[PDB]
Amino acid sequence: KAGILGVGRYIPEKVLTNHDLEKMVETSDEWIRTRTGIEERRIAADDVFSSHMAVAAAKNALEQAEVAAEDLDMILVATVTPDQSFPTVSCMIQEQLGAKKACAMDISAACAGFMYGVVTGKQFIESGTYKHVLVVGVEKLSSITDWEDRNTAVLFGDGAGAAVVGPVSDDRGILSFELGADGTGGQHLYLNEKRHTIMNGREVFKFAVRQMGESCVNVIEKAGLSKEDVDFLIPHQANIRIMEAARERLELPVEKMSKTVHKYGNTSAASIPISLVEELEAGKIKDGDVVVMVGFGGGLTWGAIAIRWGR
Amino acid sequence: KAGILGVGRYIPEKVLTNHDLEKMVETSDEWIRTRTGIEERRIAADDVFSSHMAVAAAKNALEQAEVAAEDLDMILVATVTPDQSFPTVSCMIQEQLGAKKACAMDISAACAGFMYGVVTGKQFIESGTYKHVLVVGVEKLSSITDWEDRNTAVLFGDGAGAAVVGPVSDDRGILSFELGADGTGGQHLYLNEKRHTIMNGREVFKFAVRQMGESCVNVIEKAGLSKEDVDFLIPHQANIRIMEAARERLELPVEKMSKTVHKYGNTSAASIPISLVEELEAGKIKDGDVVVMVGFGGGLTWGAIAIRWGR
């Protein structure tokens, strides 16, 4: 069975508060908090790109996993904001990390990308093909944000999260997963010709609130478990109201769902690993815990994973 | 075992000859043919994007495979020129094809992308996760070509190729594969700030000529076969001189290596499936044939696959 050996993240140091946003666009601290739950988000410096954030998250994950970069068989980077289209971020961090024998590809599934990546790594490991797969979710959404548009400029932050996937001692590891997509919703969330994110917020909300909880129930069902068997939920950190719908569907207490949207905003593919690190650093997730992760993203993509934590 | 159920392609109708190039840049028909072997290449119309070419290739592959789009479990599109970063081409063609239950992600491994994709599909099928995986290699390189630069504007064409991957009756299917990358070479082939392909042609040549043949030998070795066991070689169609080096390393006759670079140029991830369709339409590849495919790409990525043809 494939499981998670270690996780790391990179959080940019610059804090962008709602009151910093109040200068830039016609918004209010009250409106942002009430509708999204965001209070702050982090913004990468002008010389810090997805590759810089990804190497930092990757180094921390490798250190936590006790895995050397030279031992990686595969590097997968989920991003829609690479430094450039080619060379990919995965190729760039393969060089900077010294991961010589590793293959490298970037994958694009928007905010569901980290889930697509972990599931992809799972397939390569359980077939016996590879042993160690590095999966990184990284976004510099600040580089594709119309900072004049109050409807989106208050939603997005920057960051990177990373996990080393590998074989774990059985009972542990990824128990089940679901990956999905619905190209019909492509009109509702797209990058326009100015490389600016355009979103139909109402439509994306309707879709997310009903799909997040359903993907969660599916992976619990596929794992042969019950809702009471879930020890922690790590949702994509886009909107506290969407996150709350998933918590209700799973009948989980407030303290069993990771909440970092208020401090980092929506970091797209980086969101789930960033939240994972937060809970692991607070000691709220322990070996043997059943953890459900779930995300939705642009293009209308989604994914969910049920994992029993530990090696 | 996972194998290839059917293949299709889309070739743009507009032909760009070397004599059309002679008006545009300071080049000559003699120089292009002598150094690359290219005589013509195809250019997609201004209203034809990667998604349009990918749906066309996908439809032809599904028809040849006798697979309905509604039965696809996964859509993988290898491209560095999507219509936009999100929604992805895979999401776009998931909608246009009516592939409702299918998940969808784009992958980025430059000219090696189709190989990364087929191997990825192989992992999902042989684990029993999925049954039918659509893999598309598509590029509109004309949209990232500096048409003022004679060093690259004579190298690239547009196109799409597609394969349906699924379980095949054993003895058949993908016997072995190799995926690789070397981020060190990222400086030699990259997209610059104008979305123009910049290349150190001499360096990329040195790398490709020695890696194409070596990847080929590796996958033959991993399949437990000999060089005499190879019935056909389908190399990435970037440069006839690079292709010839691979043919020599495998001791193969001229008529057992696919050559379409002279008519389509370098189509990056689309190159191998486009050549596959060409040989299948000429009846040169038959069930039971051992086919080796191999490619190299920007970021310095590479891949090779040995497949026994048939279902």
Coordinates of C-alpha atoms in Angstrom, one line a residue:
Chain A
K1 CA 0.0 0.0 0.0
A2 CA 1.1 3.5 -0.8
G3 CA 1.0 6.1 2.0
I4 CA 2.4 9.5 3.0
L5 CA 5.9 9.4 4.4
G6 CA 6.3 13.1 5.2
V7 CA 4.9 16.5 4.3
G8 CA 6.2 20.0 4.1
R9 CA 5.2 23.5 2.9
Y10 CA 6.4 26.9 2.0
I11 CA 4.4 29.9 3.2
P12 CA 5.4 33.3 1.8
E13 CA 6.3 35.8 4.6
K14 CA 4.4 38.8 3.2
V15 CA 0.9 39.1 4.8
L16 CA -1.9 40.7 2.8
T17 CA -4.6 41.7 5.3
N18 CA -8.2 42.6 4.4
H19 CA -7.3 46.2 5.4
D20 CA -4.5 46.1 2.9
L21 CA -7.2 45.0 0.4
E22 CA -9.4 47.9 1.4
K23 CA -7.0 50.4 -0.1
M24 CA -6.8 48.4 -3.4
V25 CA -10.4 47.6 -4.3
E26 CA -13.9 48.6 -3.2
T27 CA -14.3 45.9 -0.5
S28 CA -14.6 45.7 3.2
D29 CA -13.1 43.5 6.0
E30 CA -16.7 42.7 7.0
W31 CA -17.8 41.5 3.6
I32 CA -14.7 39.3 3.0
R33 CA -14.9 37.6 6.4
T34 CA -18.6 37.1 6.3
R35 CA -18.7 35.5 2.8
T36 CA -15.4 33.7 2.6
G37 CA -13.9 33.6 6.1
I38 CA -10.6 35.0 4.9
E39 CA -8.8 37.4 7.2
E40 CA -5.3 37.3 5.7
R41 CA -3.4 35.6 2.8
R42 CA 0.2 35.3 1.9
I43 CA 1.8 36.8 -1.2
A44 CA 5.1 35.6 -2.7
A45 CA 7.7 38.2 -3.5
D46 CA 8.3 39.5 -7.0
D47 CA 11.4 37.3 -7.3
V48 CA 9.8 34.2 -5.7
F49 CA 8.1 31.9 -8.2
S50 CA 6.4 28.5 -8.1
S51 CA 9.7 26.8 -8.4
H52 CA 11.2 28.6 -5.4
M53 CA 8.2 27.7 -3.2
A54 CA 8.1 24.1 -4.5
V55 CA 11.8 23.4 -3.7
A56 CA 11.2 24.7 -0.1
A57 CA 8.1 22.6 0.5
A58 CA 9.8 19.6 -1.1
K59 CA 13.0 19.9 1.1
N60 CA 10.8 20.1 4.2
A61 CA 8.8 17.0 3.1
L62 CA 11.9 15.0 2.3
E63 CA 13.4 15.9 5.7
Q64 CA 10.3 14.9 7.5
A65 CA 10.1 11.7 5.5
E66 CA 13.8 10.8 6.0
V67 CA 14.0 10.4 2.2
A68 CA 17.0 11.6 0.2
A69 CA 16.3 13.5 -3.0
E70 CA 18.6 11.1 -4.9
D71 CA 16.2 8.3 -4.0
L72 CA 13.1 9.8 -5.6
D73 CA 11.8 7.9 -8.5
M74 CA 9.2 10.5 -9.6
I75 CA 8.4 14.2 -9.1
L76 CA 4.9 15.4 -9.8
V77 CA 4.1 19.1 -9.4
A78 CA 0.4 20.2 -9.6
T79 CA 0.3 23.8 -10.7
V80 CA -1.2 26.2 -13.2
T81 CA 1.4 28.9 -12.5
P82 CA 4.7 27.5 -13.5
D83 CA 7.7 29.8 -13.9
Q84 CA 7.3 29.1 -17.6
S85 CA 5.5 26.3 -19.5
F86 CA 8.7 24.5 -20.1
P87 CA 11.0 23.7 -18.3
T88 CA 8.4 22.5 -15.9
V89 CA 8.5 23.2 -12.1
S90 CA 9.0 19.5 -11.6
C91 CA 12.0 19.6 -13.9
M92 CA 13.3 22.7 -12.2
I93 CA 13.1 21.2 -8.7
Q94 CA 14.5 17.9 -9.9
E95 CA 17.6 19.8 -10.8
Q96 CA 17.7 22.0 -7.7
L97 CA 17.1 19.0 -5.3
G98 CA 19.6 16.8 -6.9
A99 CA 16.9 14.1 -7.7
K100 CA 18.9 12.6 -10.7
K101 CA 17.1 9.2 -11.3
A102 CA 13.7 10.8 -11.0
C103 CA 11.3 11.4 -13.8
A104 CA 9.4 14.7 -13.7
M105 CA 6.1 16.0 -15.0
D106 CA 3.7 18.8 -14.1
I107 CA 0.0 18.1 -13.9
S108 CA -2.9 20.5 -14.4
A109 CA -6.1 19.9 -12.5
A110 CA -6.5 23.3 -10.9
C111 CA -7.3 23.2 -7.2
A112 CA -7.8 19.4 -7.3
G113 CA -4.2 19.0 -8.6
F114 CA -2.6 17.7 -5.4
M115 CA -5.3 15.0 -5.2
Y116 CA -4.7 13.9 -8.8
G117 CA -1.0 13.9 -8.1
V118 CA -1.2 11.8 -4.9
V119 CA -3.5 9.3 -6.6
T120 CA -1.1 9.1 -9.6
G121 CA 1.8 8.5 -7.3
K122 CA -0.2 5.7 -5.6
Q123 CA -0.7 3.9 -8.9
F124 CA 3.1 4.0 -9.7
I125 CA 4.0 2.7 -6.2
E126 CA 1.4 -0.1 -5.8
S127 CA 2.3 -1.5 -9.2
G128 CA 5.9 -1.9 -7.9
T129 CA 7.1 0.5 -10.6
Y130 CA 8.4 3.2 -8.2
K131 CA 9.1 3.4 -4.5
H132 CA 9.3 7.2 -3.7
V133 CA 7.1 9.8 -5.4
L134 CA 7.3 13.5 -4.6
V135 CA 4.0 15.3 -5.0
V136 CA 4.0 19.1 -4.8
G137 CA 1.0 21.4 -5.0
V138 CA 2.2 25.0 -5.6
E139 CA 0.5 28.1 -6.9
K140 CA 1.5 31.7 -7.3
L141 CA -2.1 32.8 -7.8
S142 CA -1.0 36.4 -7.2
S143 CA 0.5 36.2 -10.7
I144 CA -2.8 35.4 -12.3
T145 CA -5.0 37.7 -10.2
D146 CA -6.6 40.9 -11.6
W147 CA -5.7 43.0 -8.6
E148 CA -8.3 45.6 -9.8
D149 CA -11.1 43.1 -9.5
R150 CA -12.6 43.0 -6.0
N151 CA -14.5 39.8 -6.8
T152 CA -11.4 37.7 -7.0
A153 CA -8.5 39.8 -5.7
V154 CA -9.6 39.1 -2.1
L155 CA -9.8 35.3 -2.6
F156 CA -6.4 34.1 -3.5
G157 CA -3.0 33.6 -1.8
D158 CA 0.3 32.0 -2.7
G159 CA 2.0 28.9 -1.3
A160 CA 3.4 25.4 -1.8
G161 CA 2.8 22.1 -0.1
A162 CA 4.5 18.8 -0.7
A163 CA 4.2 15.1 0.3
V164 CA 6.5 12.1 -0.2
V165 CA 4.5 9.1 -1.2
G166 CA 5.8 5.6 -0.7
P167 CA 5.1 2.1 0.6
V168 CA 3.8 1.9 4.2
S169 CA 3.3 -1.0 6.6
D170 CA -0.1 -2.3 5.8
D171 CA -3.4 -1.3 7.5
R172 CA -1.9 2.2 6.8
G173 CA -1.9 4.2 3.6
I174 CA -4.3 5.4 1.0
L175 CA -7.5 3.3 1.5
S176 CA -9.6 4.8 -1.4
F177 CA -9.9 7.8 -3.7
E178 CA -12.2 9.4 -6.3
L179 CA -11.1 11.7 -9.1
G180 CA -13.6 13.6 -11.2
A181 CA -14.2 16.3 -13.7
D182 CA -17.0 18.1 -15.5
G183 CA -15.9 20.2 -18.5
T184 CA -19.4 21.7 -18.7
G185 CA -18.4 24.1 -15.9
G186 CA -15.3 25.3 -17.7
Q187 CA -17.1 28.6 -18.6
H188 CA -17.5 29.4 -14.9
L189 CA -13.8 29.5 -13.9
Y190 CA -11.1 30.2 -16.5
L191 CA -7.9 32.2 -17.3
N192 CA -8.6 34.9 -19.8
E193 CA -6.3 36.4 -22.4
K194 CA -4.6 38.8 -19.9
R195 CA -3.7 35.8 -17.7
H196 CA -6.4 37.0 -15.2
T197 CA -8.7 34.6 -13.3
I198 CA -12.3 35.1 -14.3
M199 CA -14.9 33.4 -12.1
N200 CA -18.7 33.0 -11.8
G201 CA -18.5 32.8 -8.0
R202 CA -22.2 31.9 -7.6
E203 CA -22.0 29.0 -10.0
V204 CA -18.7 27.6 -8.6
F205 CA -20.2 27.9 -5.1
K206 CA -23.3 25.9 -6.0
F207 CA -21.2 23.1 -7.6
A208 CA -18.7 22.9 -4.8
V209 CA -21.1 22.8 -1.9
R210 CA -22.8 19.7 -3.3
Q211 CA -19.8 17.9 -4.7
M212 CA -17.3 18.3 -1.8
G213 CA -19.6 16.4 0.6
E214 CA -20.5 13.7 -2.0
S215 CA -16.9 12.9 -2.9
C216 CA -16.2 12.6 0.9
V217 CA -19.0 10.1 1.3
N218 CA -17.9 8.1 -1.7
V219 CA -14.3 7.6 -0.5
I220 CA -15.5 6.6 2.9
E221 CA -17.9 4.2 1.3
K222 CA -15.2 2.8 -1.0
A223 CA -12.9 2.3 2.0
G224 CA -15.6 0.2 3.7
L225 CA -15.9 2.7 6.5
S226 CA -18.6 4.8 8.2
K227 CA -18.8 8.5 8.9
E228 CA -18.0 7.9 12.5
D229 CA -14.7 6.3 11.4
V230 CA -13.4 9.6 10.1
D231 CA -10.9 11.2 12.5
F232 CA -10.0 14.3 10.5
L233 CA -11.2 16.1 7.4
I234 CA -8.9 18.3 5.3
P235 CA -10.9 20.2 2.7
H236 CA -9.7 22.5 0.1
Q237 CA -9.5 25.9 1.8
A238 CA -11.5 28.1 -0.6
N239 CA -14.5 29.2 1.4
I240 CA -15.5 28.5 5.0
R241 CA -19.1 28.1 3.9
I242 CA -18.2 25.4 1.4
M243 CA -16.0 23.7 4.0
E244 CA -18.9 23.8 6.5
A245 CA -21.2 22.0 4.1
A246 CA -18.7 19.1 3.9
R247 CA -18.4 19.0 7.7
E248 CA -22.2 18.7 8.0
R249 CA -22.4 15.9 5.4
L250 CA -19.9 13.9 7.5
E251 CA -21.4 14.8 10.9
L252 CA -18.0 15.8 12.1
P253 CA -17.2 18.1 15.0
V254 CA -15.7 21.5 14.4
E255 CA -12.3 20.5 15.9
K256 CA -12.0 17.5 13.4
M257 CA -11.9 19.7 10.2
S258 CA -8.8 21.6 9.2
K259 CA -9.4 25.4 8.9
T260 CA -6.6 27.6 7.6
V261 CA -8.6 29.6 4.9
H262 CA -8.7 32.5 7.3
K263 CA -4.9 32.9 7.4
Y264 CA -3.8 31.8 3.9
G265 CA -6.9 32.2 1.7
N266 CA -7.4 30.0 -1.3
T267 CA -4.0 28.6 -2.4
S268 CA -5.5 26.2 -5.0
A269 CA -3.4 23.0 -5.3
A270 CA -1.2 24.0 -2.3
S271 CA -4.2 24.3 0.0
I272 CA -4.6 20.7 1.3
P273 CA -0.9 20.0 2.0
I274 CA -0.5 23.4 3.7
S275 CA -3.5 22.5 6.0
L276 CA -2.0 19.0 6.5
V277 CA 1.3 20.5 7.8
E278 CA -0.7 22.9 10.0
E279 CA -2.5 20.0 11.7
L280 CA 0.5 17.8 12.0
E281 CA 2.5 20.7 13.6
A282 CA -0.4 21.1 16.1
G283 CA -0.3 17.4 16.8
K284 CA -4.0 16.9 15.8
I285 CA -3.3 14.1 13.4
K286 CA -1.6 10.9 14.6
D287 CA -0.7 7.5 13.3
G288 CA -3.7 5.3 12.7
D289 CA -6.1 8.3 12.1
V290 CA -8.4 8.0 9.1
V291 CA -8.0 11.3 7.3
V292 CA -10.3 12.4 4.4
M293 CA -9.0 15.0 2.0
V294 CA -11.2 16.6 -0.7
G295 CA -10.9 19.4 -3.2
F296 CA -12.6 21.0 -6.2
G297 CA -11.0 23.1 -8.9
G298 CA -11.2 25.1 -12.1
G299 CA -12.1 23.3 -15.3
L300 CA -14.5 21.8 -12.8
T301 CA -12.2 19.0 -11.5
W302 CA -12.5 17.4 -8.1
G303 CA -10.9 14.7 -6.0
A304 CA -11.0 13.0 -2.6
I305 CA -8.7 10.6 -0.8
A306 CA -9.2 8.5 2.4
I307 CA -5.9 7.7 4.1
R308 CA -5.0 5.9 7.3
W309 CA -2.1 8.0 8.6
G310 CA 1.3 6.5 9.4
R311 CA 4.0 4.3 8.0
Chain B
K1 CA -1.9 -5.9 -19.2
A2 CA -2.6 -2.5 -20.6
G3 CA -2.3 -2.1 -24.4
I4 CA -3.4 0.3 -27.2
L5 CA -7.0 -0.3 -28.4
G6 CA -7.0 2.4 -31.1
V7 CA -5.3 5.5 -32.4
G8 CA -6.3 8.6 -34.2
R9 CA -4.9 12.0 -35.2
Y10 CA -5.7 15.5 -36.4
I11 CA -3.4 17.0 -39.1
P12 CA -4.1 20.7 -39.9
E13 CA -4.8 21.2 -43.6
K14 CA -2.6 24.3 -44.1
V15 CA 0.8 23.3 -45.5
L16 CA 3.8 25.5 -44.8
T17 CA 6.6 24.6 -47.2
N18 CA 10.3 25.4 -46.9
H19 CA 9.7 27.9 -49.8
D20 CA 7.0 29.6 -47.8
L21 CA 9.6 29.8 -45.0
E22 CA 12.1 31.4 -47.5
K23 CA 10.0 34.5 -47.7
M24 CA 9.6 34.8 -43.9
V25 CA 13.2 34.3 -42.6
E26 CA 16.8 34.1 -43.9
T27 CA 16.8 30.4 -44.6
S28 CA 17.0 28.0 -47.6
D29 CA 15.2 24.9 -48.6
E30 CA 18.6 23.2 -48.9
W31 CA 19.7 24.1 -45.3
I32 CA 16.5 23.0 -43.7
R33 CA 16.4 19.6 -45.5
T34 CA 20.0 18.9 -45.0
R35 CA 20.1 19.6 -41.2
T36 CA 16.6 18.5 -40.1
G37 CA 15.0 16.6 -43.0
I38 CA 11.9 18.7 -42.9
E39 CA 10.2 19.6 -46.2
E40 CA 6.8 20.7 -45.0
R41 CA 4.9 21.1 -41.8
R42 CA 1.2 21.8 -41.0
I43 CA -0.1 24.9 -39.3
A44 CA -3.4 25.2 -37.5
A45 CA -5.8 28.0 -38.4
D46 CA -6.1 31.0 -36.2
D47 CA -9.4 29.8 -34.9
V48 CA -8.2 26.2 -34.4
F49 CA -6.6 25.6 -30.9
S50 CA -5.2 22.5 -29.1
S51 CA -8.7 21.6 -27.9
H52 CA -10.1 21.5 -31.5
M53 CA -7.3 19.3 -32.7
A54 CA -7.5 17.1 -29.6
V55 CA -11.2 16.4 -29.9
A56 CA -10.7 15.4 -33.6
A57 CA -7.8 13.0 -32.8
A58 CA -9.8 11.6 -29.8
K59 CA -12.9 10.9 -31.9
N60 CA -10.9 9.0 -34.5
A61 CA -9.1 7.0 -31.8
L62 CA -12.3 6.1 -30.1
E63 CA -13.9 5.1 -33.4
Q64 CA -10.9 2.9 -34.2
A65 CA -11.0 1.4 -30.7
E66 CA -14.7 0.7 -30.7
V67 CA -14.9 2.6 -27.4
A68 CA -17.7 5.0 -26.6
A69 CA -16.7 8.3 -25.0
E70 CA -19.2 7.7 -22.2
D71 CA -17.1 4.6 -21.2
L72 CA -13.8 6.5 -20.7
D73 CA -12.6 6.5 -17.1
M74 CA -9.8 9.0 -17.6
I75 CA -8.6 11.6 -20.1
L76 CA -5.0 12.6 -20.2
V77 CA -3.8 15.4 -22.5
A78 CA -0.1 16.0 -22.9
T79 CA 0.4 19.6 -24.1
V80 CA 2.3 22.8 -23.3
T81 CA -0.1 24.9 -25.5
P82 CA -3.6 24.6 -24.0
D83 CA -6.2 27.1 -25.1
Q84 CA -5.8 28.5 -21.6
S85 CA -4.2 27.2 -18.4
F86 CA -7.6 26.3 -17.0
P87 CA -10.0 24.9 -18.0
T88 CA -7.6 22.3 -19.4
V89 CA -7.7 20.7 -22.8
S90 CA -8.6 17.4 -21.1
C91 CA -11.5 19.1 -19.4
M92 CA -12.6 20.8 -22.6
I93 CA -12.6 17.6 -24.6
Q94 CA -14.3 15.7 -21.7
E95 CA -17.2 18.1 -22.3
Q96 CA -17.2 18.1 -26.1
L97 CA -16.9 14.3 -26.3
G98 CA -19.6 13.6 -23.7
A99 CA -17.1 11.6 -21.5
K100 CA -19.2 12.2 -18.2
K101 CA -17.7 9.7 -15.8
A102 CA -14.1 10.5 -16.8
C103 CA -11.6 12.3 -14.8
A104 CA -9.4 14.8 -16.6
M105 CA -5.9 16.3 -16.2
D106 CA -3.4 17.8 -18.5
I107 CA 0.3 16.7 -18.1
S108 CA 3.4 18.7 -19.1
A109 CA 6.5 16.8 -20.1
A110 CA 7.1 18.7 -23.4
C111 CA 7.9 16.4 -26.4
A112 CA 8.0 13.3 -24.1
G113 CA 4.4 14.0 -22.9
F114 CA 2.6 11.3 -24.8
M115 CA 4.9 8.7 -23.3
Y116 CA 4.4 10.0 -19.8
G117 CA 0.7 9.9 -20.5
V118 CA 0.5 6.3 -21.9
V119 CA 2.7 5.0 -19.0
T120 CA 0.4 6.9 -16.5
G121 CA -2.7 5.3 -18.1
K122 CA -0.9 1.9 -17.9
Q123 CA -0.6 2.3 -14.1
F124 CA -4.3 3.1 -13.7
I125 CA -5.4 0.2 -15.8
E126 CA -3.1 -2.6 -14.5
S127 CA -4.1 -1.7 -10.9
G128 CA -7.7 -2.4 -11.8
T129 CA -8.6 1.2 -11.1
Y130 CA -9.8 2.2 -14.6
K131 CA -10.5 0.3 -17.8
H132 CA -10.4 2.9 -20.6
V133 CA -7.9 5.8 -20.6
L134 CA -7.8 8.3 -23.4
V135 CA -4.3 9.7 -24.0
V136 CA -3.9 12.7 -26.3
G137 CA -0.7 14.4 -27.4
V138 CA -1.5 17.8 -28.9
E139 CA 0.5 21.0 -29.7
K140 CA -0.1 24.2 -31.4
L141 CA 3.6 25.1 -31.5
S142 CA 2.8 27.8 -34.1
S143 CA 1.4 29.8 -31.2
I144 CA 4.7 29.7 -29.2
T145 CA 7.0 30.1 -32.3
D146 CA 9.0 33.3 -32.9
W147 CA 8.2 33.4 -36.6
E148 CA 11.0 36.0 -37.0
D149 CA 13.6 33.5 -35.7
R150 CA 15.0 31.3 -38.5
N151 CA 16.6 29.0 -35.9
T152 CA 13.3 27.7 -34.7
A153 CA 10.5 28.9 -37.0
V154 CA 11.5 26.2 -39.5
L155 CA 11.4 23.3 -37.0
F156 CA 7.8 23.3 -35.6
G157 CA 4.4 22.2 -36.8
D158 CA 1.0 21.7 -35.3
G159 CA -1.1 18.5 -34.8
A160 CA -2.7 16.1 -32.4
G161 CA -2.5 12.4 -31.9
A162 CA -4.5 10.2 -29.5
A163 CA -4.7 6.6 -28.2
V164 CA -7.2 4.7 -26.2
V165 CA -5.4 2.6 -23.6
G166 CA -7.1 -0.4 -22.0
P167 CA -6.8 -4.1 -21.1
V168 CA -5.6 -6.4 -23.9
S169 CA -5.5 -10.2 -24.2
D170 CA -2.2 -11.2 -22.6
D171 CA 1.1 -11.6 -24.5
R172 CA -0.1 -8.2 -26.0
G173 CA 0.2 -4.8 -24.5
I174 CA 2.9 -2.6 -23.0
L175 CA 5.9 -4.8 -22.1
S176 CA 8.2 -2.2 -20.5
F177 CA 8.8 1.5 -20.3
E178 CA 11.3 4.1 -19.1
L179 CA 10.6 7.7 -18.1
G180 CA 13.3 10.2 -17.4
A181 CA 14.2 13.8 -16.9
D182 CA 17.3 16.0 -16.4
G183 CA 16.4 19.5 -15.1
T184 CA 20.1 20.5 -15.7
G185 CA 19.2 20.9 -19.4
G186 CA 16.4 23.4 -18.7
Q187 CA 18.5 26.3 -19.8
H188 CA 18.8 24.8 -23.3
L189 CA 15.1 24.7 -24.2
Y190 CA 12.6 27.1 -22.6
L191 CA 9.6 29.4 -23.2
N192 CA 10.6 33.0 -22.7
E193 CA 8.5 35.9 -21.5
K194 CA 7.1 36.6 -24.9
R195 CA 5.8 33.0 -25.1
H196 CA 8.5 32.3 -27.7
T197 CA 10.5 29.0 -27.8
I198 CA 14.2 29.6 -27.2
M199 CA 16.5 26.7 -27.9
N200 CA 20.2 25.9 -27.8
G201 CA 20.0 23.6 -30.8
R202 CA 23.5 22.3 -30.6
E203 CA 23.1 21.2 -26.9
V204 CA 19.7 19.7 -27.4
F205 CA 21.1 17.7 -30.3
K206 CA 24.0 16.3 -28.3
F207 CA 21.7 15.2 -25.5
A208 CA 19.0 13.7 -27.8
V209 CA 21.4 11.7 -30.1
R210 CA 22.8 9.8 -27.1
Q211 CA 19.6 9.4 -25.0
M212 CA 17.2 8.3 -27.7
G213 CA 19.2 5.1 -28.5
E214 CA 19.9 4.4 -24.8
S215 CA 16.2 4.6 -23.8
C216 CA 15.4 2.3 -26.6
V217 CA 17.9 -0.3 -25.5
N218 CA 16.7 -0.1 -21.9
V219 CA 13.1 -0.8 -22.7
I220 CA 14.0 -3.7 -25.0
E221 CA 16.2 -5.0 -22.2
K222 CA 13.5 -4.6 -19.6
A223 CA 11.1 -6.5 -21.8
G224 CA 13.5 -9.4 -21.9
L225 CA 14.0 -9.0 -25.7
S226 CA 16.8 -8.5 -28.2
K227 CA 17.4 -5.9 -30.8
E228 CA 16.4 -8.4 -33.5
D229 CA 13.0 -8.7 -31.7
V230 CA 12.0 -5.2 -32.6
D231 CA 9.6 -5.0 -35.5
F232 CA 9.1 -1.3 -35.6
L233 CA 10.6 1.9 -34.2
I234 CA 8.5 5.0 -33.8
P235 CA 10.8 7.9 -32.7
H236 CA 9.9 11.4 -31.9
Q237 CA 10.0 13.2 -35.2
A238 CA 12.3 16.2 -34.4
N239 CA 15.3 15.7 -36.6
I240 CA 16.1 12.9 -39.1
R241 CA 19.7 12.9 -37.9
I242 CA 18.6 12.2 -34.3
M243 CA 16.2 9.5 -35.6
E244 CA 19.0 7.9 -37.6
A245 CA 21.2 7.6 -34.5
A246 CA 18.4 5.6 -32.8
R247 CA 18.0 3.3 -35.8
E248 CA 21.7 2.6 -35.8
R249 CA 21.8 1.7 -32.1
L250 CA 19.0 -0.8 -32.7
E251 CA 20.5 -2.2 -35.9
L252 CA 17.1 -1.7 -37.6
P253 CA 16.5 -1.4 -41.4
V254 CA 15.3 1.9 -42.8
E255 CA 11.8 0.5 -43.5
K256 CA 11.3 -0.5 -39.9
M257 CA 11.5 3.1 -38.5
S258 CA 8.6 5.6 -38.9
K259 CA 9.6 8.7 -40.8
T260 CA 7.1 11.6 -41.0
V261 CA 9.3 14.5 -39.9
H262 CA 9.7 15.5 -43.6
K263 CA 6.0 16.2 -43.9
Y264 CA 4.9 17.3 -40.5
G265 CA 8.0 18.7 -38.8
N266 CA 8.4 18.5 -35.0
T267 CA 4.9 18.4 -33.4
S268 CA 6.2 17.7 -29.9
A269 CA 3.8 15.5 -27.9
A270 CA 1.7 14.8 -31.0
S271 CA 4.6 13.4 -33.0
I272 CA 4.7 9.8 -32.0
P273 CA 0.9 9.1 -32.3
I274 CA 0.8 11.0 -35.6
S275 CA 3.5 8.7 -36.9
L276 CA 1.8 5.6 -35.4
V277 CA -1.4 6.4 -37.4
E278 CA 0.7 6.9 -40.5
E279 CA 2.2 3.4 -40.2
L280 CA -1.1 1.8 -39.2
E281 CA -2.8 3.4 -42.2
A282 CA 0.0 2.0 -44.5
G283 CA -0.4 -1.4 -42.9
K284 CA 3.2 -1.6 -41.8
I285 CA 2.3 -2.4 -38.2
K286 CA 0.3 -5.6 -37.4
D287 CA -0.9 -7.5 -34.4
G288 CA 1.9 -9.2 -32.6
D289 CA 4.6 -6.7 -33.7
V290 CA 6.9 -5.4 -31.1
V291 CA 6.9 -1.6 -31.4
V292 CA 9.4 0.7 -29.6
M293 CA 8.4 4.3 -29.2
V294 CA 10.8 6.9 -27.8
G295 CA 10.9 10.6 -27.3
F296 CA 12.9 13.5 -25.8
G297 CA 11.6 16.9 -24.8
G298 CA 12.1 20.3 -23.3
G299 CA 12.9 20.6 -19.6
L300 CA 15.0 17.7 -20.7
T301 CA 12.5 14.9 -20.3
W302 CA 12.4 11.6 -22.1
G303 CA 10.5 8.4 -22.3
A304 CA 10.4 5.1 -24.2
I305 CA 7.8 2.3 -24.4
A306 CA 8.0 -1.3 -25.8
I307 CA 4.6 -2.6 -26.8
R308 CA 3.4 -5.8 -28.5
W309 CA 0.7 -4.6 -30.8
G310 CA -2.8 -5.9 -30.7
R311 CA -5.7 -6.6 -28.4

